Ligand binder design. Structure first.
Ligand SMILES: CC[C@H]1OC(=O)/C=C/[C@H](C)[C@@H](O[C@@H]2O[C@H](C)C[C@H](N(C)C)[C@H]2O)[C@@H](C)C[C@@H](C)C(=O)/C=C/C=C/[C@@H]1CO[C@@H]1O[C@H](C)[C@@H](O)[C@@H](OC)[C@H]1OC
Ligand SMILES: [Mg+2]
Ligand SMILES: [Mg+2]
Ligand SMILES: [Mg+2]
Ligand SMILES: [Mg+2]
Ligand SMILES: [Mg+2]
Ligand SMILES: [Mg+2]
Ligand SMILES: [Mg+2]
Ligand SMILES: [Mg+2]
Ligand SMILES: [Mg+2]
Ligand SMILES: [Mg+2]
Ligand SMILES: [Mg+2]
Ligand SMILES: [Mg+2]
Ligand SMILES: [Mg+2]
Ligand SMILES: [Mg+2]
Ligand SMILES: [Mg+2]
Ligand SMILES: [Mg+2]
Ligand SMILES: [Mg+2]
Ligand SMILES: [Mg+2]
Ligand SMILES: [Mg+2]
Ligand SMILES: [Mg+2]
Ligand SMILES: [Mg+2]
Ligand SMILES: [Mg+2]
Ligand SMILES: [Mg+2]
Ligand SMILES: [Mg+2]
Ligand SMILES: [Mg+2]
Ligand SMILES: [Mg+2]
Ligand SMILES: [Mg+2]
Ligand SMILES: [Mg+2]
Ligand SMILES: [Mg+2]
Ligand SMILES: [Mg+2]
Ligand SMILES: [Mg+2]
Ligand SMILES: [Mg+2]
Ligand SMILES: [Mg+2]
Ligand SMILES: [Mg+2]
Ligand SMILES: [Mg+2]
Ligand SMILES: [Mg+2]
Ligand SMILES: [Mg+2]
Ligand SMILES: [Mg+2]
Ligand SMILES: [Mg+2]
Ligand SMILES: [Mg+2]
Ligand SMILES: [Mg+2]
Ligand SMILES: [Mg+2]
Ligand SMILES: [Mg+2]
Ligand SMILES: [Mg+2]
Ligand SMILES: [Mg+2]
Ligand SMILES: [Mg+2]
Ligand SMILES: [Mg+2]
Ligand SMILES: [Mg+2]
Ligand SMILES: [Mg+2]
Ligand SMILES: [Mg+2]
Ligand SMILES: [Mg+2]
Ligand SMILES: [Mg+2]
Ligand SMILES: [Mg+2]
Ligand SMILES: [Mg+2]
Ligand SMILES: [Mg+2]
Ligand SMILES: [Mg+2]
Ligand SMILES: [Mg+2]
Ligand SMILES: [Mg+2]
Ligand SMILES: [Mg+2]
Ligand SMILES: [Mg+2]
Ligand SMILES: [Mg+2]
Ligand SMILES: [Mg+2]
Ligand SMILES: [Mg+2]
Ligand SMILES: [Mg+2]
Ligand SMILES: [Mg+2]
Ligand SMILES: [Mg+2]
Ligand SMILES: [Mg+2]
Ligand SMILES: [Mg+2]
Ligand SMILES: [Mg+2]
Ligand SMILES: [Mg+2]
Ligand SMILES: [Mg+2]
Ligand SMILES: [Mg+2]
Ligand SMILES: [Mg+2]
Ligand SMILES: [Mg+2]
Ligand SMILES: [Mg+2]
Ligand SMILES: [Mg+2]
Ligand SMILES: [Mg+2]
Ligand SMILES: [Mg+2]
Ligand SMILES: [Mg+2]
Lengths: 134, 206, 118, 57, 115
RNA sequence: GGAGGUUUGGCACCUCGAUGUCGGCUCGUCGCAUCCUGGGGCUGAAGAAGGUCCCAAGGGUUGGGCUGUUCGCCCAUUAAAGCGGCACGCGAGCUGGGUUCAGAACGUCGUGAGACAGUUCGGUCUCUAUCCGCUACGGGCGCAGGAGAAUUGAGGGGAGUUGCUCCUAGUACGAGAGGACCGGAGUGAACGGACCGCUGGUCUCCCUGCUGUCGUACCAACGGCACAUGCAGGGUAGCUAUGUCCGGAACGGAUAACCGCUGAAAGCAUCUAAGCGGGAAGCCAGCCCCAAGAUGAGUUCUCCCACUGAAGGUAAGACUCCCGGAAGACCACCGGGUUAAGAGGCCAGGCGUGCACGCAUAGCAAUGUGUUCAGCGGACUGGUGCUCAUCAGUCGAGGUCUUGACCA
RNA sequence: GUGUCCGAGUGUCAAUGCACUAAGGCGCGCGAGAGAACCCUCGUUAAGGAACUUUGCAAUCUCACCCCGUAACUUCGGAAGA
RNA sequence: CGAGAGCUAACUUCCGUAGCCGAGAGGGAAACAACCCAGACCAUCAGCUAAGGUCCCUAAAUGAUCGCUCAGUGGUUAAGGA
């Protein structure tokens, strides 16, 4: 569960380290890139939901510097996620990974395992770069 | 229309194919056909049938004679199903087939006298930023002088519980025929072991 | 509330037992679940969780165990029902000495020296 | 704050309020093994028998 | 609500609930009968029956399991060597209540508890 | 030219033996001059996105930074971030930031005491609800006999939102880029009900570990106090969300703007003047819940009958009391009450804890191993007559009359 | 509220502190049930972490002793338990 | 009714004038100090009338005759249109 003010850790090498969320969305991956809408009142990003955020600390030398507005997608809840079989997964630390408005990541490689729900939301590009799913 | 009575037993895990699902086990045991109400002799069409036999020593005489018209053992519960005209006795197998939607009606669990934050999802009010309605309290209750009224219908502390509740489009997961059990997808209301009734969907949506 | 004379317990257990499988007795040492996952489109795939077993919960169909790994730097944990069809097989790797049934302290430790005894 | 009642309450409405304070006479019943009366599911105060003699006195 | 919980506070805290149970145990074991309020007697019966069945094991473990609740040694010997072997034949149900009726001061309905 | 009364006002009518005032918070409900959604007309409407007007109030209308703010600005989203009323709704509901009591300081005015609706720090918001009104829960009585149980629904409520994607179909349209109506399939969001199998919360003495100090003679082993659990570590049943399942709907009817059929008054034309058909998230019905104190008191099935002198023993049948209950403040409801598994206990199983005491051994010892998947035990599932539901008591029908029909 | 004097022990760097307790003294002159809403003093809390709000107000968090290490600035003492 | 002041606003304010109210009961105007009728000495289970009325509430013609409006106009305005 992501909410505004919840800092998350970037899952890529785009060159920010920490991004405080500022909105949950409700759009997926469409054929015109990312979708719009879904209703604008949802209040919890779970794994595989897009979420605007302000970058808080970044790396010196970086595509993304500090303070910039960026749409991340989330790959690592501390909260549990539960499959259609009854598995549960949880990760010690929350983590997200920045993107551009087509769903393509903005870093070279994703860093640490991503949830498999990303595969359910046709986020193919992110999950290609990821050392493990689950 | 078609329906039967039974008792909620408990909840469980289940695997249809590989998808784990929560089912609820009702026991819909055989029901005698006590009284066949027809509009030509009762003004409306219905059937009344029984569940959970009662020891004949515990019956009143009038109820022994009510059942005794029908050749039926005393049963602690009788109920009526509108538009329903079976034959013999209402076994649960014959009434249901696996996967069909069935409304599930039972009596909600009585939680007694409940506040507004619990009963109506009220907001609460700060738990530290000054008050002494720290939680719980409904706040204001009306306008002012014009309508001096507080609206009829107004939501308030009260008996949150014990309501009859219907729950729509539950899915028959499985039918054990010779046990008179019946699995239903997801939850039904009640304390365990309360009466409940299973019926055809009130709205057969496409 | 109807008042049948009924064993609620054996009634449940009779339908909860078709859906109960048993596997290798343990609790708290390290383990490898060889699971299927098929979310890969239509084709099927294996995948391997190996971590400490930190808890045992449930019975019959509802029984489920909790295993904890560190994969690529980040800690991971997971709850498998013993009954789950997407859990093909489970093998131990080594028995652990442990004074206690839960091992939630492993969450706070996350070092090499925060191991399980042999 | 400080609610108070408005108009003094009348004799009649007061009595309708007290309409429920009627006391309920105990269902007394005489001891089979003695003279006197005894409360049901208790020992006879006078004799002390609940079936033999149960209390001392 | 208590839609399944079990017990009673007796208008007191945890340690008080506890000493009261332990000490009325000690008394009705010391003395075979006592008279006390009807509530508190219904309270006492399952406690003290559990305890006599603890003492029905014979063993040093059973006597130490009783010694923890009954810290006057002489009652521990009574319940252990005198009373539990007596109830040897009894499948549970080592106590009864009859109700003596109502007290004057507070208008409580007191009762007797014996074995 | 009108309308509405939400603004700044005017006026001074009730209120100075008191009508608490701005903002927030909490609850809401209403209007419609309609922010979204639905149905339309015209369009400088190809398509798509629009403009603007008409009908439409069922529901819905986001979260943050700035300031006491309302407002406004901005962030980032949205189907949309509607406008007002209800003492600028709501302090016997809450705050107390603003402003408006005493302190003090600054600027400005005054020779001075002092001052400005200029500023700045600070500054007591009163346990007990009679009535009406509102949510719950009983008692009495009524319903032309006395009773157990099932019911019809007069008539009352709740619910009512929508986005996105896909198919149709890259078709109609379009030079092209773009790109549909209608119909069909799916998937979320927020909200609601229920539920506790799952994921977790908590479970104040169910199990364990820890310290100090007392105490059980001492050692061992335990208890007490360290909170009203000493602290920590887990935690079953219950209760619960962030957790699960369900929902909004379709079909129907009459309708608003609108669109038409037949068609005159005027041998044309015209949806109307007689007549008829089509048309909305709205009205009625349809879904779920209440309900015959619907004194208009309803129906059906069954039982006891016709007793003795308004009364009294009584039948059918309730209650009192006892024991309890996923029922509850009390009441009430549900179960059992000896032709009895109602609860307790006891036994077996479940689940929680995690290897008890003691003894053996290892080792200077701290401690380690075995016996020991041990020991212990709240609420869980069943059995079992070991304990309590003993004895009893109390109440409870003889059914008015008139008219009409059917029977000897 | 009320001036002066004496005020033991165990442990804890120390102490008249804190916890348990000797002596001594007392359970505070309505009780008993029950385990609704609400209210007061409290314990734990998923995920998030100040989003709350006039203001982080309140409640956390920090906690004693020992060793190491500590800035801008300075009136050379200090800031410093940084 | 006649003026001023006001916006040819006000249950506004200030004068002239008549009447009512103050000090006034009774019938009408659903209700209503001011409007319309009518100034209560007392008593009656008597009669004619005023204003206002005559379908039922609710006393009294579902009165009569020539029309007018098919809008519930009646039972809330205007410029303007038909
Ligand atoms: C009840 C709590 C206090 O409440 C108060 O202080 C409450 C006072 C109320 C609110 C006041 O009334 C208000 O006055 C406004 C100017 C107008 C307002 N409305 C109506 C427009 C009106 O409500 C006060 C002045 C009214 C009366 C009741 C009064 O003078 C009260 C005096 C005493 C009141 C109370 C006295 O409190 C005192 O405070 C000390 C700190 C206490 O230790 C104790 O002193 C012995 C206590 O008693 C004097
Ligand atoms: Mg910038
Ligand atoms: Mg709150
Ligand atoms: Mg008020
Ligand atoms: Mg009004
Ligand atoms: Mg009124
Ligand atoms: Mg924990
Ligand atoms: Mg007050
Ligand atoms: Mg008390
Ligand atoms: Mg035992
Ligand atoms: Mg007054
Ligand atoms: Mg007043
Ligand atoms: Mg309109
Ligand atoms: Mg539109
Ligand atoms: Mg278009
Ligand atoms: Mg609205
Ligand atoms: Mg409003
Ligand atoms: Mg105003
Ligand atoms: Mg106001
Ligand atoms: Mg203030
Ligand atoms: Mg000067
Ligand atoms: Mg300030
Ligand atoms: Mg108070
Ligand atoms: Mg008080
Ligand atoms: Mg009648
Ligand atoms: Mg109806
Ligand atoms: Mg009514
Ligand atoms: Mg469509
Ligand atoms: Mg709910
Ligand atoms: Mg649990
Ligand atoms: Mg010792
Ligand atoms: Mg010990
Ligand atoms: Mg002590
Ligand atoms: Mg002490
Ligand atoms: Mg604990
Ligand atoms: Mg329709
Ligand atoms: Mg028409
Ligand atoms: Mg039609
Ligand atoms: Mg709809
Ligand atoms: Mg009689
Ligand atoms: Mg009862
Ligand atoms: Mg009974
Ligand atoms: Mg007996
Ligand atoms: Mg039983
Ligand atoms: Mg040992
Ligand atoms: Mg317990
Ligand atoms: Mg049992
Ligand atoms: Mg038997
Ligand atoms: Mg000294
Ligand atoms: Mg000392
Ligand atoms: Mg010392
Ligand atoms: Mg001290
Ligand atoms: Mg003294
Ligand atoms: Mg005392
Ligand atoms: Mg507290
Ligand atoms: Mg928390
Ligand atoms: Mg943090
Ligand atoms: Mg805020
Ligand atoms: Mg602050
Ligand atoms: Mg301040
Ligand atoms: Mg503070
Ligand atoms: Mg320097
Ligand atoms: Mg220095
Ligand atoms: Mg320091
Ligand atoms: Mg003028
Ligand atoms: Mg005037
Ligand atoms: Mg004047
Ligand atoms: Mg005068
Ligand atoms: Mg006069
Ligand atoms: Mg007059
Ligand atoms: Mg009038
Ligand atoms: Mg009149
Ligand atoms: Mg007057
Ligand atoms: Mg007058
Ligand atoms: Mg007037
Ligand atoms: Mg006139
Ligand atoms: Mg006349
Ligand atoms: Mg006349
Ligand atoms: Mg008349
Ligand atoms: Mg005109």
């Amino acid at each position: 569960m992501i909410m505004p003010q919840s800092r998350l850790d970037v899952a890529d090498n785009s060159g920010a380290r920490e991004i405080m969320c500022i909105r949950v969305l409700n759009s997926g991956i469409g054929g015109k890139g990312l979708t719009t809408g879904g209703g604008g009142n949802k209040r919890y990003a779970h794994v595989g939901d897009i979420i605007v955020a302000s970058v808080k600390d970044a790396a010196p030398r970086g595509a993304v510097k500090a303070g910039d507005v960026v749409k991340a997608v989330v790959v690592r809840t501390s909260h549990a996620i539960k499959r259609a079989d009854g598995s549960t997964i949880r990760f010690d630390r929350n983590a997200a990974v920045i993107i551009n408005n087509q769903g393509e990541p903005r870093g070279t490689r994703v860093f640490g395992p991503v949830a498999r729900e990303l595969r359910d939301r046709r986020f193919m590009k992110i999950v290609s770069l990821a050392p493990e799913v689950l | 229309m078609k329906g039967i009575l039974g008792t909620k037993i408990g909840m469980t895990q289940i695997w249809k194919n590989d998808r784990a699902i929560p089912v609820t086990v009702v026991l819909a045991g055989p029901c005698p056909i006590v009284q066949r109400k027809t509009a030509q002799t009762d003004g409306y069409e219905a059937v009344q049938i029984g569940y959970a036999p009662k020891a004949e020593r515990k019956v009143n005489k009038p109820m022994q004679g009510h059942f005794a018209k029908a050749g039926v053992a005393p049963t602690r519960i009788l109920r009526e199903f509108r538009g329903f005209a079976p034959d013999g006795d209402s076994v649960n197998v014959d009434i249901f087939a696996e996967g069909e939607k069935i409304d599930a009606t039972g009596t909600s669990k009585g939680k007694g006298t409940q506040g507004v934050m619990k009963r109506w999802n009220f907001a609460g009010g700060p738990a530290s930023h000054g008050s002494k309605k720290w939680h719980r309290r409904p706040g204001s209750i009306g306008q002012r002088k014009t309508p001096g009224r507080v609206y009829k219908g107004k939501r308030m502390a009260g008996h949150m519980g014990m309501e009859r509740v219907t729950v729509q489009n539950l899915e028959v997961v499985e039918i054990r025929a010779g046990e008179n059990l019946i699995l239903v997808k997801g939850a039904i209301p009640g304390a365990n072991g309360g009466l409940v009734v299973l019926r055809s969907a009130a709205k057969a949506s496409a | 509330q109807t008042h049948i004379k009924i064993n609620r317990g054996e009634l449940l257990r009779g339908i909860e037992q078709d859906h109960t499988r048993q596997l290798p007795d343990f609790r708290p040492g390290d383990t490898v679940r060889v699971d299927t996952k098929v979310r890969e489109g239509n084709r099927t795939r294996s995948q391997a969780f190996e971590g400490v077993v930190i808890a045992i919960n449930g019975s019959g169909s509802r029984k489920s165990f909790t295993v904890r790994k560190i994969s690529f730097g980040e800690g991971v944990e997971r709850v498998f029902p013993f009954a789950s069809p997407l859990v093909n097989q489970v093998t131990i790797v080594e028995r652990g000495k442990v004074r206690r049934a839960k091992l939630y302290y492993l969450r706070e430790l996350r070092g090499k020296a925060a191991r399980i005894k042999s | 704050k400080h609610p108070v009642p408005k108009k003094k309450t009348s004799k009649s409405k007061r009595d309708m309020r007290r309409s429920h304070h009627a006391l309920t006479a105990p269902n007394l019943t005489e001891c089979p093994q003695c003279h006197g009366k005894k409360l049901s599911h208790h020992i006879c105060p006078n004799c002390g028998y609940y079936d033999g003699r149960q209390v001392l006195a | 609500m208590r839609h399944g919980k079990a017990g009673r506070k007796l208008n007191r805290n945890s340690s008080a609930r506890v000493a009261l149970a332990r000490a009325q145990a000690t008394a009705l074991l010391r003395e075979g009968r006592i008279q006390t309020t009807l509530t508190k007697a219904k309270e006492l019966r399952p406690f003290v029956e559990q305890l006599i069945t603890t003492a029905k094991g014979g063993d040093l473990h059973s006597r130490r399991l009783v010694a923890q609740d009954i810290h006057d040694k002489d009652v521990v010997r009574k319940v252990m060597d005198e009373v539990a072997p007596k109830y040897a034949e009894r499948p549970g149900g080592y106590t009864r209540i009859l109700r003596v009726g109502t007290r004057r001061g507070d208008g409580v309905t007191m009762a007797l508890i014996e074995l």
